[PDB]
Design a protein around this nucleic acid. Structure first.
Ligand SMILES: Nc1nc2c(ncn2[C@@H]2O[C@H](COP(=O)(O)OP(=O)(O)OP(=O)(O)O)[C@@H](O)[C@H]2O)c(=O)[nH]1
Ligand SMILES: [Mg+2]
Ligand SMILES: [Mg+2]
Ligand SMILES: [Mg+2]
Ligand SMILES: [Mg+2]
Lengths: 14, 46, 104, 350, 51, 360, 49, 286, 49
RNA sequence: GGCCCAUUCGGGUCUUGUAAUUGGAAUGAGUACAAUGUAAAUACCUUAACGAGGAACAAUUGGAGGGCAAGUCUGGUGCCAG
């Protein structure tokens, strides 16, 4: 339900 | 498990909608009806 | 007189209150909140039907006229005394019948 | 030193305490006729302040703050302009320059209220190219027409309503809501014909980066063994694993008799047991209503008429009907979906 | 099967050509009857009301 | 390409300004030379908070963590819960959201969990009585910060609910060219998991300093007791000087540490309030950044805000330079015609920002 | 030229979309699907509502 | 109760007009009509009356001083292009809608009105031509009445529709053009929401600033640096470079450089400032 | 009929039994089902008496 | 079979209906040759030829009732009600 309506996202490559 | 969540979500959404629709109707009837009855009395006074 | 002596009143469309109502062509769906330009008082008006609700949008100039109910209806919302007769200077019925296009 | 520390710097407590033993330093601190005229007073009052403040500043300071005011004759230099513009330059065709607000730069899904033009002969189809004119820009997109279903969901429509508005979602440069637009299917003179070319008219209602259009997907099955309320259904599913996912789901017949998927049958695969509010018949068809997501195609083809030599023969993605004619393909058709006259024999019972 | 397909496509091509025949040879495009009178959406009326 | 910045300085503001302007930015060389380079945990937590209220935003953190790329999306909002790491209080996260909430598609209803106070970040009462009133002046009619549970350091355990019901096109243009008159002094002296006597002792100390004034002093005693008192003992005082003529407020706040005298803290905070009033012309130094940003994102008109010479410090200058880098907007300062004081008028032209995320 | 390069890319994009309009719809897009109409075991992966 | 009703018609939605208080830009007058209806002959005739100089060849915008404080820019819409029809409809303050009286309304004439109504209706004047082709006064009168009444449906009732009989020496009758120039002068232009929120300009001249050797060492395919001149309209344009801007039919570009130049066609109410009719010297064309 | 177009009051046609199922008989609709249920309840009512 | 009255049950009366096919006549708006008219001209009056079946040579405005789907939403005491 958190993933349903999202398009961005923090891409943490550390 | 998914069935339980969907039913509870749907029931909650329906209850909120019915409360919201009642409020907008009741507030309009009370506030606008007061103005309507007020104006009609002035017309009778005239 | 409801408009302070005038037969019609100019107004500004603020919001469409019943937009979220689920039942189509409901009494609530046809209600729009309007601010009278003459005195700034906020009032509620009826649109003839939901088809006409499309033409009305926020911040549009609208001419209001009294709404007369010959007899009680099951679903009517008493208190609403006005109906929208023109939007941006064009008759709603003319728009509803596709005889004119709303100028912006 | 830095704004992350919300509290501001203060001197040492005893120094402030001596400083503020005596508070004398800070003791100093302790009709228009019509509502329309009232508003017009407010705008004019604000406009007057702008002029007074601008008059105060120097001309260079003015130009730095307000910018180049309208009425100014200016020279604007551009770089990285296509060579076709300089070569295929016709003074008859105007060059219109338009400033863009921050929203105009962004690309995303535009949700709008749209209708077929009353004088346009034909209705529009979903995923059918349409040249739109939003703001200063013209481009070709693939819009999806949708309905609310009594304000419950965004369901995909096949065509525009004949004589009313419908919601439309398409991908392109974002614009402020309440921005009107108009749509055209063809712009080249070669294809103009004699009909009206303005295809659609609409108004932008919302901007977003994603949309959740969904389409009605019905699963169809048939009974094969009926016992009063209970019945065994076949062809709905392929394996007993699929049935397990849908146990407890609502189902109904064409007659409108409501039921439920109770349990999957071990033999044969895909069959299942259901209970209905009333006895069903062998001629009935059971349907399960389900919803499947639909995705907007991200197609962007700006109309660069000026760059072309002709400037009146710009052509983009073609309509589905045109594509079928070019490839000599028949319009898809389903014999079952066709409507026929239905004659009913008088109903009698024993 | 191929014979039927040719018949369907052939029927469509003829109809499209028939539509093209309506297009006037002269360059000028004249408004059709719908745009001219602008009667909009009206109910169906009986001819007795005409007189 | 990306507008580049250097260092961790003004991290929240730069992220907030980029979100409002929609211009992608790069922040590089974040604590490059430290033994522990790159972002802190609360900074990564803050970025996660930004994503929860926006859609379509792209945030990339370098492999070493010393560089951040931010491509903002549209402000959306909605209902959510955010767990604040113990390194920072809730106020460190509630504060930036005040810049974004009134310009959202959906209403902001965020539940913040964690420590509710610290020596360096905004307190609950600072936001409620010190910053939210400023927003109300700019047109944010309905904004509230409900305190459900107080959590003092180090164990915290508090819960606060930010609700901003008002969604507006843009802030109203400010016009204040006068020095507000203070009518009364109010405040909140609070305590958690300790005896009530501490709160009454802080009020006594503050009243000692403020009694010389000619205006009323009414400090409330909000003693928190029971399940809603968090997990650690704590106490603090916040004093707000109010000007009911135009609804302006000047405030100072601090919390008590282990071994500190409650009377001394009340004396200090009340003594700091007078210092803040001395340094202020229209808004406090702590309320100044919020006002300036709102004027920048207002309508394309010349707003006027009076400021003192004491408010023009390093923090004021760096704020203006960051704004210009993002918005290209220049703050023009002119002297006031008076000789009793040395104030200046900060005049900013709005950029014509409009809330385009909201459906119409 | 840069404009010509963009046109070549768009012409590629247009060619793909023209085929998709012609091509038969996916089983999910078709209304009233049946077990024979669709692939076997599809609904396990689809995650319908 | 007319007094109450009359006062109501004065009321409108309050709006902010961004037009400068001093030295406003010329109004953009778009001459729109089907091919061959007389766009070029009308522009030449109007310019000769307004300037007393006859332009044998007209191309692109033409700026003239039609009044002591009013300036007008004439732009001829290519009748064969719908893309051009769209982008003039987004900027034109006044539209001179040409109608062939003999033929009647055409598709292009009706297409432009619908585009105009949806993007913000400007001031519209109908100008009927080819009336000399009529042979009978009885049928001429009927056609004029029918044409006017249909025009009143698209544009507010009582909208002015002019009549032009014939062309002499590529010019319309001198008095009739005088009346047309008169009604343009008495026009009052109301603000449009889109035009008052964005900056825009119609390019008066186009120049390529690319160094010729660069065209040779790399070839014609190389991208070009160009300079575009014209009057600014709408909201002020920011002075700093880097401002994003869209050129219709070309794409989105960033302003590399910008500078203000002395007005080529200054209005003479400004100069005299530095009941009296316009001096002949004051009327200018650019 | 006030404020309703004739297009709104358009007839929606009735669909028919699938050919693969033509042997079973006529596809019952709601009206057909009502005839069954009413008849059954009339008989069951008398039998209970 | 149509129509009339009647809250109720029912009662009164007779050439009616077509959402069928078909025939030849008439003429006005229009398209318009002339003369007359007038300082000249417009207009008026008079007057050759052509001018109808979707007579598409395509008047409106308002009101009262319906009926339909493998459609949608809401509330329930199955199959109902809105
Ligand atoms: N008889 C008559 N001819 C006219 C009239 N107005 C224009 N014309 C003629 O129409 C022809 C075209 O005139 P233009 O001025 O070129 O018209 P346009 O709009 O510029 O046409 P394009 O530029 O080619 O698109 C010329 O031969 C004119 O003499 C009129 O009122 N009567
Ligand atoms: Mg020409
Ligand atoms: Mg008319
Ligand atoms: Mg006959
Ligand atoms: Mg008639």
């Amino acid at each position: 339900k958190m993933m349903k309506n999202k398009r961005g996202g923090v891409i943490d490559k550390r | 498990f998914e069935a339980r969540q969907r039913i509870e979500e749907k029931n909650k959404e329906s209850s909120d909608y019915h409360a919201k629709m009642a409020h907008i109707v009741n507030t309009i009837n009370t506030e606008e009806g007061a103005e309507k009855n007020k104006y009609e009395r002035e017309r009778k006074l005239r | 007189s409801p408009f302070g002596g005038s037969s019609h009143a100019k107004g500004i469309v603020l919001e469409k209150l019943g937009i979220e109502s689920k039942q189509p062509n409901s009494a609530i769906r046809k209600c729009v909140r309007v601010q009278l330009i003459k005195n700034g008082k906020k009032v509620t008006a009826f649109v003839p039907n939901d088809g006409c609700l499309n033409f009305v949008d926020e911040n549009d100039e609208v001419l209001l006229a009294g709404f007369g109910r010959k007899g009680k209806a099951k679903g009517d919302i008493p208190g609403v005394r006005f109906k929208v007769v023109k939007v941006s200077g064009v008759s709603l019925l003319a728009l509803w019948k596709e005889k004119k296009e709303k100028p912006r | 030193v830095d704004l992350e520390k919300f509290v501001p710097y203060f001197d040492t407590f005893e120094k402030l305490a001596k400083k503020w033993k005596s508070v004398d330093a800070i003791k100093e601190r302790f009709e228009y006729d019509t509502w329309y005229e009232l508003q017009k007073a407010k705008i004019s009052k604000q406009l007057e302040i702008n002029n007074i403040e601008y008059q105060e500043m120097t001309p260079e300071q003015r130009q730095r703050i307000e910018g180049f005011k309208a009425g100014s004759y200016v020279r604007i230099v551009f770089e990285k302009v296509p060579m076709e513009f300089v070569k295929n330059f016709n003074p008859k065709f105007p060059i219109v320059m338009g400033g863009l607000l921050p929203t105009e730069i962004k690309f995303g899904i535009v949700k709008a209220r749209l209708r077929r033009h009353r004088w346009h002969k034909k209705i529009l189809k979903t995923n059918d190219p349409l040249v739109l004119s939003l703001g200063w820009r013209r481009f070709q997109t693939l819009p999806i027409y949708t309905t609310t279903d009594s304000r419950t969901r965004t369901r995909m429509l096949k065509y525009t309503p004949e004589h009313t508005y419908c919601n439309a979602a398409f991908y392109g440069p974002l614009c402020s809501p309440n921005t009107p637009f108009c749509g055209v299917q063809i712009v080249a003179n070669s294809d103009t014909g004699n009909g009206f070319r303005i295809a659609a008219t609409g108004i932008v209602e919302e901007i977003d980066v994603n949309i959740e259009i969904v389409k009605k997907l019905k699963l169809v099955g048939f009974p094969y063994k009926i016992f009063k309320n209970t019945a065994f259904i076949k062809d709905m599913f392929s394996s007993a694993m699929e049935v397990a996912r849908f146990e407890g789901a609502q189902i109904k017949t064409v007659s409108g008799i409501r039921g439920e998927i109770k349990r999957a049958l071990s033999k044969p695969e895909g069959h299942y047991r259901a209970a209905f509010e009333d006895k069903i018949l062998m001629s009935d068809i059971v349907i399960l209503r389900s919803w499947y997501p639909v995705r907007v195609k991200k197609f962007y083809n700006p109309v660069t008429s000026l760059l072309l030599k002709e400037k009146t023969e710009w052509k983009g993605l073609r309509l589905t009907g045109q594509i079928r004619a070019a490839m000599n393909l028949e319009t898809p058709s389903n014999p079952d979906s066709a409507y026929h006259k239905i004659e009913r024999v008088e109903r009698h019972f024993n | 099967k191929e014979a039927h397909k040719n018949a369907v496509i052939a029927a469509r091509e003829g109809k499209l050509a028939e539509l093209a025949e309506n297009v006037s040879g002269d360059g000028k495009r004249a408004i059709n009857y719908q745009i001219l009178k602008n009667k909009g959406l009206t109910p169906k009326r009986n001819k007795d009301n005409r007189n | 390409k990306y507008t580049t910045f250097q260092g961790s300085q003004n991290f929240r503001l730069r992220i907030v300004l980029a979100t409002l302007s929609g211009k992608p930015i790069k922040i590089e060389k974040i604590r490059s030379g430290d033994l522990n380079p790159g972002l802190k945990d609360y900074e990564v937590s803050f970025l996660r908070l930004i994503e929860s209220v926006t859609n379509g935003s792209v945030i990339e953190i370098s492999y070493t963590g010393t560089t951040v790329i931010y491509r903002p999306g549209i402000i959306v909002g909605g209902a959510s819960t955010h767990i604040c790491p113990s390194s920072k209080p809730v106020g460190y996260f509630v504060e930036p959201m005040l810049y974004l909430a009134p310009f959202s598609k959906k209403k902001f209803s965020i539940l913040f969990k964690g420590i509710t106070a610290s020596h360096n970040d905004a307190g609950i009462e600072a936001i409620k009585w010190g910053l939210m009133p400023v927003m109300e002046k700019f047109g944010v009619r309905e904004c509230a910060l409900h305190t459900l549970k107080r959590g003092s350091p180090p164990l915290g355990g508090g819960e606060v609910h930010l609700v901003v019901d008002s969604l507006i096109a843009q802030p109203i243009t400010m016009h204040e060219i006068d020095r507000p008159i203070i009518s009364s002094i109010t405040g909140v002296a609070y305590s958690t998991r300790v005896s009530p006597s501490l709160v009454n002792r802080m009020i006594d100390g503050a009243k000692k300093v403020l009694k010389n004034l000619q205006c009323e002093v009414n400090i409330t005693a909000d003693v928190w007791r029971g399940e809603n008192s968090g997990k650690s003992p704590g106490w603090g005082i916040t004093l707000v000087a109010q000007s009911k003529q135009k609804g302006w407020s000047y405030f100072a706040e601090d919390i008590g540490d282990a071994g500190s005298i409650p009377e001394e803290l009340g004396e200090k905070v009340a003594c700091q309030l007078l210092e803040e009033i001395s340094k202020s012309a229209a808004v406090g130094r702590n309320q100044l950044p919020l006002a300036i940003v709102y004027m920048v994102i207002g309508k394309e008109d010349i707003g006027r805000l009076r400021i003192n010479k004491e408010q023009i410090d390093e923090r004021f200058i760096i704020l203006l330079r960051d704004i210009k880098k993002i918005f290209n907007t220049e703050v023009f300062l002119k002297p006031v015609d008076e000789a009793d004081n040395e104030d200046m008028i900060a005049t900013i032209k709005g950029i014509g920002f409009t809330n385009t995320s909201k459906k119409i | 030229s840069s404009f010509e390069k963009q046109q070549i890319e768009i012409r590629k994009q247009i060619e793909q979309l023209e085929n998709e309009a012609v091509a038969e719809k996916k089983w999910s897009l078709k209304g009233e699907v049946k077990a024979k109409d669709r692939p076997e075991d599809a609904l396990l992966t689809e995650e319908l509502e | 109760q007319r007094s109450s009703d009359v006062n109501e018609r004065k009321l409108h939605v309050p709006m902010v007009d961004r037009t400068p208080e001093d030295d406003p830009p010329p109004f953009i007058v778009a001459v729109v009509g089907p091919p061959g209806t007389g766009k070029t002959t009308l522009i030449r005739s109007l310019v000769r009356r307004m300037t007393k100089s006859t332009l044998n060849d007209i191309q692109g915008p033409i700026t003239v001083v039609s009044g002591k404080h009013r300036r007008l820019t004439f732009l001829e819409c290519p009748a064969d292009d719908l893309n051009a029809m769209i982008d003039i409809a987004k900027i034109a303050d006044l539209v001179l809608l040409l109608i062939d009286g003999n033929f009647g309304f055409e598709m292009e004439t009706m297409e432009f009105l619908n585009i105009a109504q949806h993007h913000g209706m400007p001031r519209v004047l109908g100008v009927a031509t080819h009336l000399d082709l009529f042979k009978s006064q009885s049928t001429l009168r009927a056609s004029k009445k029918r044409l006017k009444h249909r025009f009143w449906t698209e544009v507010y009732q009582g909208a002015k529709l002019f009549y032009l009989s014939g062309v002499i020496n590529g010019r319309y009758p001198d008095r009739e053009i005088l009346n047309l120039s008169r009604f343009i002068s008495v026009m009052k232009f109301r603000p449009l929401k889109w035009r008052n929120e964005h900056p825009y300009m119609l390019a008066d001249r186009f120049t390529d600033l690319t160094h010729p050797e660069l065209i040779e060492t790399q070839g014609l395919q190389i991208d070009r640096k160009v300079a575009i001149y014209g009057y600014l309209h709408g909201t002020p344009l920011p002075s700093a470079p880097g401002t994003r801007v869209h050129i219709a039919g070309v794409g989105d570009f960033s302003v590399a450089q910008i500078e203000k130049l002395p007005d080529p066609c200054p209005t003479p109410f400004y100069q005299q400032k530095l009941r009296k009719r316009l001096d002949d010297k004051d009327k200018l064309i650019y | 009929a006030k404020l309703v177009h004739d297009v709104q009051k358009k007839q929606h046609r009735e669909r028919s039994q699938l050919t693969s199922r033509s042997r079973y008989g006529f596809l019952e609709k709601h009206k057909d089902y009502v005839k069954r249920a009413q008849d059954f309840h009339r008989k069951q009512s008398t039998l209970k008496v």
